[PDB]
Amino acid sequence: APQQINDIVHRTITPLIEQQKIPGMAVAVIYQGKPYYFTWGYADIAKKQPVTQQTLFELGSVSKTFTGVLGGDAIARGEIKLSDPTTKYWPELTAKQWNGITLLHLATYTAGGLPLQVPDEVKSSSDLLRFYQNWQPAWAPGTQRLYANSSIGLFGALAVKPSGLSFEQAMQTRVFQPLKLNHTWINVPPAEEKNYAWGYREGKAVHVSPGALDAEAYGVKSTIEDMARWVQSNLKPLDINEKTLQQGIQLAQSRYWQTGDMYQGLGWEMLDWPVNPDSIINGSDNKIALAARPVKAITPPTPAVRASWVHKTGATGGFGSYVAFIPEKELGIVMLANKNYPNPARVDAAWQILNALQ
Ligand SMILES: [Cl-]
Ligand SMILES: [Zn+2]
Structure with missing residues (x-):
């Protein structure tokens, strides 16, 4: 890699690892469209297995960017419209509070207070219907944003219904395979477990546990190389030969x-570039990121703005991830760690690197 990239990465990420006690980390810096890779530490501490460019990490909510793009691909196929009512795809949701709640609201966390988590007691299809049938909104739809797995998670599950495919099959055939993300998984196959890093919470090795709508909301595992390719795909949608996927990527950045x-956006969140770094750092703190906040509609949605900071944080019990990129500059970063450490530290490190290379 160029000397300037090696220097800033060492001076930014090695101290971050020192400060946050991260056991293993992988970083890709996309510079002038090309990825440069860095690894530190261990995927499995007790086995002394190092992090490599083939190590799988839990992406947590970075999974939502895949869900948003898959939804965008469905829009471009004419299979769904964001103005469609939820009940078009789930007629059994007869409770009156669902009148007026569209796929748009589900995708963008604006249905009116759907909760951050689907309750852990939901283990069956009927449990899930009961949950949504009895949920009472705190606000009218399209007025308040409340980040929620139960919102975008349901969006993903319904967006694939017209295709007749399961969510996992739609994602594999329509997103992972065309983009050659061949080491990206909703369910890690037995032959790839050897590359699945352990997450570390309070010194204990942990993996994410199954939950309702997990694949849609937080269930993807991927390598640093596949995540660099995901960033490249979102930086340069016109290089994607499948028109519906090219358009789906663009729609997720609307x-x-x-x-x-x-x-x-759809999964992705965006700010105008140049960005105020304190706003992305401070706004990533869960005290803000998880709070209800009034929203103003953009009608029609603004088509993807190239001069944007586009990003997403993700966490599971044992992992912390961050992706950010700037289309206008063909500049991006992926940070995958097997400890869940505070979002503001992730964003600050990412901005120090990309700011140095702009
Ligand atoms: Cl140094
Ligand atoms: Zn040093």
Whole structure:
């Protein structure tokens, strides 16, 4: 890699690892469209297995960017419209509070207070219907954003219904395979477990446990190389030969809602570039990121703005991930760690690197 990239990465990430006690980490810096890879530490501490460019990490909510793009691909196929009512795809949701709640609301966390988590007691299809049938909104739809797995998670499950495919099969055939993400998994196969890093929570090795709508909301595992390719695909949609996927990527970076200086995409979140770094750092703190905030609609949605900071944080019990990129500059970063450490530290490190290379 160029000397300037090696220097800033060492001076930014090695101290981050020192400060946050991260056992293993993989970083890709995309510079002038090309990825440069860095690894530190261990995928499995007790086995002394190093992090490599083939190590799988839990992406947590970075999974939502895949869900948003898969939804965008469905829009471009004419299979769904974001204005469609939820009940078009789930007629059994007869409770009156669902009148007026569209796929747009589900995708962008604006249905009116759907909760952050689907409750752990939901283990069956009927449990899930009961949950949504009895949920009472705190706000009218399209007025408040409340980040929620139960919102975008349901969006993903319904967006694939017209195709007749399962969510996992739709994602594999329509997103992973065309983009040659051949080491990206909703369910890690037995032959790849050897590359599945352990996450570490309070010194204990952990993996994410099954939950309702997990594949849609937080269930993808991937390598640093496949995640660099995901960033390249989102930086350069016109290089994707499948038109519906090219358009799906673009639609996921459309701006549908604004609150403060932040815009909500489909999975992705965006700000205008140049960005105020303190706003992305401070806004990544869960005290803000998980809070209810009024939104203003953008009608029609703004088509993907190349001068944007586009990003997403993700966490599981044992992992912490961050992706950010700037289409106008062909500049991006992927940070995958097997400890869940605070989002503001992730964003600050990412901005120090990309700011140095702009
Ligand atoms: Cl140094
Ligand atoms: Zn040093």
